[PDB]
Structure 1
Amino acid sequence: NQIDLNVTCRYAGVFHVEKNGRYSISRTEAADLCQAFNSTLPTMDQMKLALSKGFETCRYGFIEGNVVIPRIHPNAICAANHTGVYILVTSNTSHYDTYCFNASAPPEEDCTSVTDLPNSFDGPVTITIVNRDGTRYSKKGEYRTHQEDI
């Protein structure tokens, strides 16, 4: 009973989380996941400031109200070569990654490891935070509050 959470550097507090390295987070699970990181889903204004500080990914993820990919460099296989905060308009499907915003993060780029899920609650799941440099932090707990997500 295990969940891996792949996390990025923070840029102005905003980071990206992938569950088990595949698109697999529902909108409800996204909110619970950010809450476990003592974070919230970013607003579009928070995401645009993060973008300005160097944040980009090649993955769709929830923010408050939309699913987006932040892009700095045009790449043909990421967001159809767009730059800026690219907003997903048309999809059949409901599961993506998530973005999260932690107000206590440094103001610009923070590429130190993420070390904890401070607001996870008691539970049976081994949850592992996986940083891009491979550093891992694990704890037993739970973060999902909706049955439909378990």
Structure 2
Amino acid sequence: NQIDLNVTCRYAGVFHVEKNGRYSISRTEAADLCQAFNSTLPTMDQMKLALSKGFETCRYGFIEGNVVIPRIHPNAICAANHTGVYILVTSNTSHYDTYCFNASAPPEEDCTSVTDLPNSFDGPVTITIVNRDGTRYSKKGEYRTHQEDI
């Protein structure tokens, strides 16, 4: 009864979260996950500012209203060599990573570790935050509010 959450640096408060090392988050779970980090799904404008501060990934994830990949450098295997906030247009499937936005983060790049899931609720799951440098923080709790996600 364990969930690993891989988290990135924040860029203008925006970060990427991947659950259990694979595309595995529904739209509803993504909102609940961001809420657990006292965050929200980013708007497109928030994501564009994050991009301008250095944010890029090679993974699809939810924002408010779309699934996107922020890209700074063109790479053939990431968003088909596009740059900018690449919007996923056509897909059969519903599960991705998520982006989240924390307004209380620093204004530019913050590559410090994340060491709390401050708004998790009581529950039986061992939830582990994993930072890119390997630092880990674990707590027992839950964050999913929709049964179809459990």
How would you bin the TM-score normalised by the shorter chain? over 0.9
For the residues of structure 2 that align with 1:103 and 1:80, how far apart are their CA atoms?
A: 31
Instruction: Give 1:53 shift.
Output: 0.1
For the residues of structure 2 that align with 1:117 and 1:146, how far apart are their CA atoms?
A: 19
Instruction: Give 1:46 shift.
Output: 0.1
**1:33-73 deviation digits (Å, cap 9, x = unpaired):** 00000000000000000000000000000000000000000
Instruction: Give 1:112 shift.
Output: 0.1
Secondary structure of 1:28's counterpart equals helix
Secondary structure of 1:106's counterpart equals coil
| Structure 2: gaps (5+ residues) | none
**1:76-121 deviation digits (Å, cap 9, x = unpaired):** 0000000000000000000000000000000000000001110000
Identity of matched residues, %: 100
Instruction: Give 1:31 shift.
Output: 0.1
4+ residue segments displaced more than 3 Å:
none
Give RMSD over aligned pairs.
0.2
Determine the structure 2 residue equivalent to 1:134.
Answer: 134
Instruction: Give the length in aligned residue pairs.
Output: 150
**1:124-145 deviation digits (Å, cap 9, x = unpaired):** 0000000000000000000000
Secondary structure of 2:50's counterpart equals helix
